[PDB]
Structure formats: structure tokens, C-alpha cells
Amino acid sequence: NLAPLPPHVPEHLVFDFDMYNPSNLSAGVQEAWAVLQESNVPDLVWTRCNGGHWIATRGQLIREAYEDYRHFSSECPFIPREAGEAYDFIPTSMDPPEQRQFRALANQVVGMPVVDKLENRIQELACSLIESLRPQGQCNFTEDYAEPFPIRIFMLLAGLPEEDIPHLKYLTDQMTRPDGSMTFAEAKEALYDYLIPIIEQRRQKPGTDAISIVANGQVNGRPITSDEAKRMCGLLLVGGLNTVVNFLSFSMEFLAKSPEHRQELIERPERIPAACEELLRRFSLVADGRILTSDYEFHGVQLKKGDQILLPQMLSGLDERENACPMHVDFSRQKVSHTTFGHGSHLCLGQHLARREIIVTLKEWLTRIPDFSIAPGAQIQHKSGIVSGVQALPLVWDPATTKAV
Numbered sequence: 001n002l003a004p005l006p007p008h009v010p011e012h013l014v015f016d017f018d019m020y021n022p023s024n025l026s027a028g029v030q031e032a033w034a035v036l037q038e039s040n041v042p043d044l045v046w047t048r049c050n051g052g053h054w055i056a057t058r059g060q061l062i063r064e065a066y067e068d069y070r071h072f073s074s075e076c077p078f079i080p081r082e083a084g085e086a087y088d089f090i091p092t093s094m095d096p097p098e099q100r101q102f103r104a105l106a107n108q109v110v111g112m113p114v115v116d117k118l119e120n121r122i123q124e125l126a127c128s129l130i131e132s133l134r135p136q137g138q139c140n141f142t143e144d145y146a147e148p149f150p151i152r153i154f155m156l157l158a159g160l161p162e163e164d165i166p167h168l169k170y171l172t173d174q175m176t177r178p179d180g181s182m183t184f185a186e187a188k189e190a191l192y193d194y195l196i197p198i199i200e201q202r203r204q205k206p207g208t209d210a211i212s213i214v215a216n217g218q219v220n221g222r223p224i225t226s227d228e229a230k231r232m233c234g235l236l237l238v239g240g241l242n243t244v245v246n247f248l249s250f251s252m253e254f255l256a257k258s259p260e261h262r263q264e265l266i267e268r269p270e271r272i273p274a275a276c277e278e279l280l281r282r283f284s285l286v287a288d289g290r291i292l293t294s295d296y297e298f299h300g301v302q303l304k305k306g307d308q309i310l311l312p313q314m315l316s317g318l319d320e321r322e323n324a325c326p327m328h329v330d331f332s333r334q335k336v337s338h339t340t341f342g343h344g345s346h347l348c349l350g351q352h353l354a355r356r357e358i359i360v361t362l363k364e365w366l367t368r369i370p371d372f373s374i375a376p377g378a379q380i381q382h383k384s385g386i387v388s389g390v391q392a393l394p395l396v397w398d399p400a401t402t403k404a405v
């Protein structure tokens with residue numbers, strides 16, 4: 001159902017795009033979202049779907065809005081409104097300068113230093129998972145690697161039982177790609193019920209894991225509260241279980257269909273970091289937004305206080321104004337422009353971990369399984385939401401062409 005058009009919204013700016021089920025989804029999710037950048041669509045439109053909200057379609061506007069937190073607040077960053085209001089993760093639900101201290105603490109646990117420290121376990125796991133698959137001559141990448149690799153590394157960092165992964169993944173799936181079984185608030189409360197006793201125990205008997213570090217951290221001179229700890233940890237769980245996990249599948253689906261791109265990285269490995277960046281652009285997958293703090297005219301459009309605006313991080317790099325031939329993958333672009341990891345004060349803190357996991361995957365997989373393809377008769381399907389994903393990715397290969405190291 002489309003929501004009634006608000007009086008202040010001109011009819012020529014309406015474009016009923018459903019971020020949870022785009023029309024051209026069969027052509028791939030990024031392609032489905034790119035229809036918003038066709039010549040028939042204004043730079044800023046209003047969709048009546050999911051309660052009704054604005055959507056900035058150009059990199060220029062997305063960057064702008066993400067910078068101007070005074071007008072575009074993180075307080076209600078998710079669509080639909082019920083989700084945006086229930087969303088209380090730290091520091092994502094706060095605007096500068098309040099998020100400052102909280103962002104610093106989260107940085108201690110998932111920042112650059114920590115990624116350096118865990119580099120060996122990351123390399124270890126990738127190699128391990130891949131050496132297991134190698135002889136099989138086939139695998140469902142989404143469950144055999146995309147999920148275990150990033151998630152187990154996160155469980156290791158947070159000090160959580162790998163036994164809890166299925167329960168935790170389901171809950172985070174409901175917060176990014178809702179299947180209807182639970183509302184955001186319900187998924188959040190279940191997640192919080194899981195976290196609370198664990199935070200309690202670690203505040204009493206502190207450890208070296210991320211949860212202990214956060215739970216016993218200091219924010220602005222005083223100790224962090226159990227609630228604040230819970231809200232930051234809730235966010236870490238989502239980032240850990242529902243980001244790289246989804247992205248790896250888009251990348252590997254592409255590689256499975258691009259023999260020439262695979263060989264290119266095999267021959268010239270020094271290019272992998274650039275290829276990681278290019279894949280991050282072409283297969284960007286996040287889309288959240290902000291809320292108007294007051295009436296405001298943005299690029300000739302009258303925005304009303306309380307209006308929600310989706311600022312798809314995914315679109316900036318697909319914008320032909322930012323990158324020529326945006327849908328083409330070219331590992332040697334002189335500049336890969338994108339906002340895949342966000343923009344503004346909330347720029348992703350886990351980006352260093354994400355890039356390491358991606359780069360390690362690229363090199364390690366290609367070393368052992370240089371030639372692979374999508375299973376014949378496989379119909380790959382994508383799913384859309386706050387973070388898009390791949391339903392399943394059936395891969396097949398000849399073991400005789402692979403090699404152990």
C-alpha cells in the first residue's frame with residue numbers, strides 16, 4: 001500500500017521506489033536501485049512506499065546531507081519510521097558532538113589497531129575455510145564462506161560462542177532485511193535480552209574481548225552505563241554479522257562470471273587493494289538515512305520537520321556523475337569514488353576490518369581456486385533492505401585445476 005501523499009510534496013517529485021523490494025530486483029539489486037538515477041527521475045524524489053519518505057539519488061546530495069547533521073539528524077536513521085524510532089544504537093543514533101566520546105570507544109575495539117592485532121587469525125581462518133572447500137569442487141558460498149569467515153572472526157573479537165551465531169544472525173537479518181516475522185523493536189529487544197546478562201558478567205569479571213572493553217569503558221570522564229554499553233554492542237553485532245557477510249557474496253558472484261578479472265588479480269596481486277575498492281563501489285550495499293530537524297529547502301525542495309530522508313550510501317558510486325560507466329568493473333580506475341562506508345561524522349569504524357577481510361579473501365581464494373563458476377541452472381537472487389544481500393551462491397569447479405599452498 002502506498003501512503004497518502006503529504007500536502008507539501010509536489011506530485012512531479014513522486015517516485016514510488018520500495019527500498020525493501022525494488023522492481024528490477026531480478027537484474028540485480030544495484031541495478032534495481034540504479035533506476036532512480038535514470039533521466040526521468042529528479043535528484044530528490046518522494047516515495048509513498050513504506051510510510052512515505054524522500055530519497056536523494058545523487059552522490060552530491062547524499063554527501064551534503066550526510067555532512068549537515070544540524071538539518072539531517074541521526075536520531076531516526078531507519079525507514080520505516082517505526083524502525084527509525086526504535087533504533088537506539090550508539091553512536092549511530094546520536095549527532096555530533098554527543099557521538100564523539102562513544103565513537104572513540106567503539107574505535108578502540110574495532111579500529112585499525114585491533115585489525116592489525118588479529119591479522120594472523122584472519123589469514124588463518126580464510127586459508128582454513130578455503131582449503132576445506134577446495135577438494136569438494138563445489139560449495140554454497142553464502143553459507144560455506146561468506147558467513148563463517150567474517151562472523152567467526154567477529155565472534156572471536158567479541159568473545160561470544162560460535163553456537164550463538166544462528167540465533168544472532170536471524171535477529172540481525174530482521175533489522176536489515178525484515179521477512180515480516182518481527183518488527184525492528186522486537187528484533188532489538190531479543191538482541192538486547194541476549195546482551196544484557198553477558199554485559200553484567202563482563203562488567204563484574206572483565207576480560208580482553210570487545211564486549212568487556214566496551215562495557216568497562218569510560219565516556220567523558222565517567223564510566224559507561226550498562227544501557228550505553230548495550231546499545232553500542234547491539235550495533236557491533238549488526239556490523240559484525242550483516243555487512244562483509246553480504247558484500248563477499250556480491251564480489252564472488254562477479255568473480256565467478258569474470259575469468260579475465262580473476263586472472264588479472266592472480267597475475268598482478270598488488271592490484272587486489274584497488275580491486276577491493278572497485279568492488280566496494282560497484283557492489284555497494286547499504287542504504288540508511290536521516291530525519292529533518294526543522295523545515296528546510298534543500299536544492300529547491302521544501303523539506304518538512306520530521307520528514308524522513310533516505311540517503312543511499314550505495315548510489316553515490318553508481319552515479320555516472322561520480323564515475324564514468326558506473327556499472328562496469330574496472331580495477332584500474334584512476335579514482336574509485338564512493339560512499340560505501342558512509343560519509344560525515346558516522347563514517348564506518350569497521351571499514352579497516354572490512355577491507356582486510358575482503359583483501360585476504362580475494363588473494364587466498366584466488367590462490368587455491370583460480371577457476372570457478374556459478375553452478376549451471378543456478379538462478380542467483382538478491383534481496384534489498386538497509387543492507388542488501390545474496391540469497392544463495394552455488395559455485396562449482398574442477399579440483400584438478402585448484403592447488404593447495
Ligand code: HEM
Pocket residue numbers: 074077090091092093099103106110235236237238239240243244247285286288289313339340341342343345346347348349350351353354
Ligand atoms: C562491507 C562492510 C561494511 C559496510 C559497507 C559498512 C557500512 C557502514 C555505513 C554506511 C556506516 C554509516 C551509517 C550512518 O551514517 O548512519 C557505518 C557505520 C559503522 N560501521 Fe560499518 N560497515 C561495514 C562493516 C562494518 C563492520 C565489520 C563493523 C564492525 C563490527 C562495522 C561497524 C560500524 C560502526 C560501529 C559504525 C558507527 C560509527 C559511528 O556511528 O560513528 N561496520 N558502516
Ligand SMILES: CC1(C)[C@@H]2CC[C@@]1(C)C(=O)C2
Pocket residue numbers: 089092176235238239243286287288386387
Ligand atoms: C547502516 C549499517 C551498515 C551501519 C553498521 C550496521 C548498520 C546496519 C548500521 O546500523 C550502521
Ligand SMILES: [K+]
Pocket residue numbers: 075076077084085086087088093
Ligand atoms: K531512535
